[PDB]
Structure formats: C-alpha cells, structure tokens
Design an enzyme around this catalytic site. Structure first.
Site, PDB file in Angstrom:
ATOM      1  N   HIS A 121    -104.933 -26.943 -43.061  1.00  0.00           N
ATOM      2  CA  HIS A 121    -106.405 -26.811 -43.035  1.00  0.00           C
ATOM      3  C   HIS A 121    -106.981 -26.339 -41.682  1.00  0.00           C
ATOM      4  O   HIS A 121    -107.902 -26.933 -41.109  1.00  0.00           O
ATOM      5  CB  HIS A 121    -107.042 -28.126 -43.528  1.00  0.00           C
ATOM      6  CG  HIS A 121    -106.786 -28.407 -44.985  1.00  0.00           C
ATOM      7  ND1 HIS A 121    -105.885 -29.354 -45.425  1.00  0.00           N
ATOM      8  CD2 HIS A 121    -107.295 -27.833 -46.099  1.00  0.00           C
ATOM      9  CE1 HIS A 121    -105.861 -29.358 -46.745  1.00  0.00           C
ATOM     10  NE2 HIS A 121    -106.701 -28.438 -47.180  1.00  0.00           N
ATOM     11  N   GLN A 171     -94.506 -28.134 -56.179  1.00  0.00           N
ATOM     12  CA  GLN A 171     -95.145 -26.865 -56.440  1.00  0.00           C
ATOM     13  C   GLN A 171     -95.114 -26.559 -57.943  1.00  0.00           C
ATOM     14  O   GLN A 171     -96.097 -26.083 -58.482  1.00  0.00           O
ATOM     15  CB  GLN A 171     -94.518 -25.728 -55.616  1.00  0.00           C
ATOM     16  CG  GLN A 171     -94.948 -25.701 -54.153  1.00  0.00           C
ATOM     17  CD  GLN A 171     -96.464 -25.813 -53.963  1.00  0.00           C
ATOM     18  OE1 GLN A 171     -97.225 -25.074 -54.583  1.00  0.00           O
ATOM     19  NE2 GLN A 171     -96.893 -26.724 -53.108  1.00  0.00           N
ATOM     20  N   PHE A 184     -97.872 -28.659 -59.415  1.00  0.00           N
ATOM     21  CA  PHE A 184     -99.143 -28.117 -58.946  1.00  0.00           C
ATOM     22  C   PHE A 184     -99.515 -26.912 -59.823  1.00  0.00           C
ATOM     23  O   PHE A 184    -100.641 -26.822 -60.320  1.00  0.00           O
ATOM     24  CB  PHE A 184     -99.006 -27.716 -57.461  1.00  0.00           C
ATOM     25  CG  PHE A 184    -100.283 -27.242 -56.789  1.00  0.00           C
ATOM     26  CD1 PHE A 184    -101.493 -27.890 -56.969  1.00  0.00           C
ATOM     27  CD2 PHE A 184    -100.241 -26.159 -55.911  1.00  0.00           C
ATOM     28  CE1 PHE A 184    -102.641 -27.445 -56.301  1.00  0.00           C
ATOM     29  CE2 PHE A 184    -101.373 -25.710 -55.270  1.00  0.00           C
ATOM     30  CZ  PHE A 184    -102.578 -26.371 -55.455  1.00  0.00           C
TER      31      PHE A 184
HETATM   32  C1  LIG Z   1     -97.632 -30.217 -52.769  1.00  0.00           C
HETATM   33  C2  LIG Z   1     -98.268 -29.932 -54.108  1.00  0.00           C
HETATM   34  C3  LIG Z   1     -99.718 -29.507 -53.883  1.00  0.00           C
HETATM   35  O1  LIG Z   1     -99.736 -28.255 -53.197  1.00  0.00           O
HETATM   36  C4  LIG Z   1    -100.882 -27.695 -52.639  1.00  0.00           C
HETATM   37  C5  LIG Z   1    -102.107 -28.362 -52.633  1.00  0.00           C
HETATM   38  C6  LIG Z   1    -103.241 -27.799 -52.048  1.00  0.00           C
HETATM   39  C7  LIG Z   1    -104.572 -28.522 -52.074  1.00  0.00           C
HETATM   40  C8  LIG Z   1    -105.548 -27.756 -52.976  1.00  0.00           C
HETATM   41  C9  LIG Z   1    -105.131 -28.781 -50.666  1.00  0.00           C
HETATM   42  N1  LIG Z   1    -105.004 -30.219 -50.519  1.00  0.00           N
HETATM   43  C10 LIG Z   1    -104.554 -30.816 -51.635  1.00  0.00           C
HETATM   44  O2  LIG Z   1    -104.669 -31.997 -51.959  1.00  0.00           O
HETATM   45  O3  LIG Z   1    -104.444 -29.814 -52.654  1.00  0.00           O
HETATM   46  C11 LIG Z   1    -103.136 -26.529 -51.470  1.00  0.00           C
HETATM   47  C12 LIG Z   1    -101.919 -25.850 -51.454  1.00  0.00           C
HETATM   48  C13 LIG Z   1    -100.795 -26.423 -52.055  1.00  0.00           C
HETATM   49  O4  LIG Z   1     -99.579 -25.793 -52.070  1.00  0.00           O
HETATM   50  C14 LIG Z   1     -99.302 -24.532 -51.448  1.00  0.00           C
HETATM   51 MG   LIG Z   2    -111.268 -28.821 -48.701  1.00  0.00          MG
HETATM   52 ZN   LIG Z   3    -109.686 -25.516 -48.750  1.00  0.00          ZN
END
Ligand SMILES: CCCOc1cc([C@]2(C)CNC(=O)O2)ccc1OC
Ligand SMILES: [Mg+2]
Ligand SMILES: [Zn+2]
Length: 338
Positions: A72, A281, A284
């Site tokens: 960040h 990932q 996610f």
């Molecule tokens: C580790 C699994 C989550 O991964 C990410 C999360 C995030 C965000 C959106 C930022 N902070 C978080 O909690 O989620 C950004 C990038 C990511 O991976 C490249």
């Molecule tokens: Mg934010």
């Molecule tokens: Zn952001």
C-alpha cells in the site's frame, strides 16, 4: 527520460508497466502517471487547474503514502489511477460520464489508500488504535484516506479544484467519498450484489453504449469501476501480477509478525509459517476477483473478455504451482476478519 517516454506510450493500455514508470521517475509514479493522465484527457485545461498547483498537490499526496509499506505505497495508488483511466475509456461507457465524473474517479483512485500504515482495518480495531477510535470502527482506513486527501486540498498552494464552481466541488466531493468508501473490502459482497442487479436491468443505445438514467446509476458504475481497479492485479500480465503478489504477501506477513509479537491471534492469511501464497491467490481469484470481473464483463461486453481470459490463465498458473456464495463470504472474512 527515453525509457520513461517509451513506457508511457502504453498509457491508455492495460499492459502499461507501472513498476518501470516508478524506476524512471525517481520513485514518484503517482505524480508521473497522474500528470500523464490529466494531460492525456485535457483535464488541466477543462478545469483551469494550474500545472504547478497540480504537481505540488500530487507530490505532497505521494509523499503521504509510506515508502516502507510493501504493497500500500504510492506505486499501488499509481496502478489504481492508471487502471481507472483505462476503464473509463471502455467502449461500452463512451460519452456516459461528464468531465467532472471522470475527474472524480481518477482523483479518488489517486488518494484512495493515502497514509495507509500496512495493517488492516481489523488490526487497527483490535489494537485500539487512535484511528479506530477516531472513526468508530467503521471503514477506518478509508475514512482516513479521504480525510487526508481532502485536508491536503485546503491551502491555496494545493487547491487543484479552485476553479470548479461551488456546485461542482460539492458534487465531486460527494462522488469521491462514495468511491473511496467503496474500496473497503468489507463492502465487497454488497457492491457485487448491487452490480449484478445493475447488469440485470442493463439498457443500451442501438450502438451498444450503456444507458445510465441519473446520478444514482452513474455513481454505482463508478464505485464498482474503482473497486475493480483496486482488484485488478490478477487481470494484468503474469509478470506484473506476480510482483503484486510478492508485495501483498510481504505486507500481510509483516502484519502477522506484529500480531504474534503482541500475543494476539494470528490472522491465517498473515501467518508466514502456515499460509500458502499460491492457494491464497487461487482463492482470491475464485471467490473475489473473478466473480466481480465476470459481472463487470457482463456490464461492458464484450470489452473485458481479454481481461477475463488473462484472469483464467493467471489462476491456472498459481494452481499449477500448488503441489459458491458461501465460500464467497468465507474469503471476504479471511481478508477483512469482519
Ligand atoms: C493473499 C490473498 C489476497 O490477495 C490480495 C489482496 C488484496 C487486497 C484487495 C488488499 N488488501 C486485502 O485485504 O485485499 C490485493 C492484492 C492481492 O493479491 C495480489
Ligand atoms: Mg484500501
Ligand atoms: Zn487499494
């Protein structure tokens, strides 16, 4: 320089490499990209924003991102701003937004994580931080990013919106607050449910351009656009995405170490001794990123198909490195701990 101008040739493209831009602009990628974006869209002219004032504001804003925070930092803000800039030009949205709305979205993107400390909202709440006490546990960071961004505009030597009308400043502020608050992941599921409802009632001109009735529908698309931009790392080239993953995991793991030191419970995806980077990932993408971008792609079809295809390839790569609605909520909890 020579390399910087070469990389900036991709300003209007998803394949722009912001790491390269940072390397050639003395670690001021946000300043750099915002000046390139504003020049490209003629925003300085349109809104009578002096170049000196704009640069001073952007440099100060940039300096308010923490360079020792792995993810960040100002490079993430620059990425979200450039991604937003590319999303505003998707053919399905041609001529839909006013100049003020375009200005608001890009500005929101630039300020959206300013002064981020590298720890989550829940960490700030659980450690009784000054920020959580100030903001009563609700969208702590996001309220803070907005306050910083808008506080910096107070001072003539930095008021880039000096030449907007009073009504314009009020509308812009309303819009920007809306967009930044929407980047709080705890609101992800609601944003998505609301965006799906928008896709369901989607209307277009005979040309294939979205029809947005009034402000409510326009701001809903813009909130989601900035959120998509914020969640755009897995939709970029694999070379870029892997660097973004290295960064978020460095930041998360440092939070986990802080949790361990203070004897608090370790957030699972912040525990370096247990968490699989690769599985994280995959999850996610499966439960957060793909569902959102699948819906965005529906809204602007067929403009986002390439992004969806890249997303699928990237997911399969991470899965190869490992030796629905219910899990959607599960992954949102793992990130937020809400
Ligand atoms: C580790 C699994 C989550 O991964 C990410 C999360 C995030 C965000 C959106 C930022 N902070 C978080 O909690 O989620 C950004 C990038 C990511 O991976 C490249
Ligand atoms: Mg934010
Ligand atoms: Zn952001």
């Amino acid at each position: 320089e020579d390399h910087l101008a070469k990389e900036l040739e991709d300003l209007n493209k998803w394949g722009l490499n912001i790491f390269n831009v940072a390397g050639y602009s003395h670690n001021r990628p946000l300043t750099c990209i915002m000046y390139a974006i504003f020049q490209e869209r003629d925003l300085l002219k349109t809104f009578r924003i002096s170049s000196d004032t704009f640069i001073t504001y952007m440099m100060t804003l940039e300096d308010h991102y923490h360079s020792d925070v792995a993810y960040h930092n100002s490079l993430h803000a620059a990425d979200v701003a450039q991604s937003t800039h590319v999303l505003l030009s998707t053919p399905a949205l041609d001529a839909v937004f006013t100049d003020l709305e375009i200005l608001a979205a890009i500005f929101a993107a630039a300020i959206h994580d300013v002064d981020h400390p590298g720890v989550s909202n829940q960490f700030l709440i659980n450690t009784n931080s000054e920020l959580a006490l100030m903001y009563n546990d609700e969208s702590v960071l996001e309220n803070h990013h907005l306050a910083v961004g808008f506080k910096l505009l107070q001072e003539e030597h930095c008021d880039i919106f000096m030449n907007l009308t009073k009504k314009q400043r009020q509308t812009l502020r309303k819009m920007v607050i809306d967009m930044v608050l929407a980047t709080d992941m705890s609101k992800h599921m609601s944003l998505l449910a609301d965006l799906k409802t928008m896709v369901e009632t989607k209307k277009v001109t005979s040309s294939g351009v979205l029809l947005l009735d009034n402000y409510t529908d326009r701001i809903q698309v813009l909130r989601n656009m900035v959120h998509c931009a914020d969640l755009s790392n897995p939709t970029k080239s694999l070379e870029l995405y892997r660097q973004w993953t290295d960064r978020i995991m460095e930041e998360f793991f440092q939070q986990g170490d802080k949790e361990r030191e203070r004897g608090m419970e370790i957030s699972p995806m912040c525990d370096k001794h247990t968490a699989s980077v690769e599985k994280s990932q995959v999850g996610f993408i499966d439960y957060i990123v793909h569902p959102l971008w699948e819906t965005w792609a529906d809204l602007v079809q067929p403009d986002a198909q390439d992004i969806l295809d890249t997303l699928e390839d990237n997911r399969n790569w991470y899965q190869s490195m490992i030796p629905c609605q219910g899990l959607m909520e599960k992954f949102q909890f793992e990130l937020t701990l809400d």
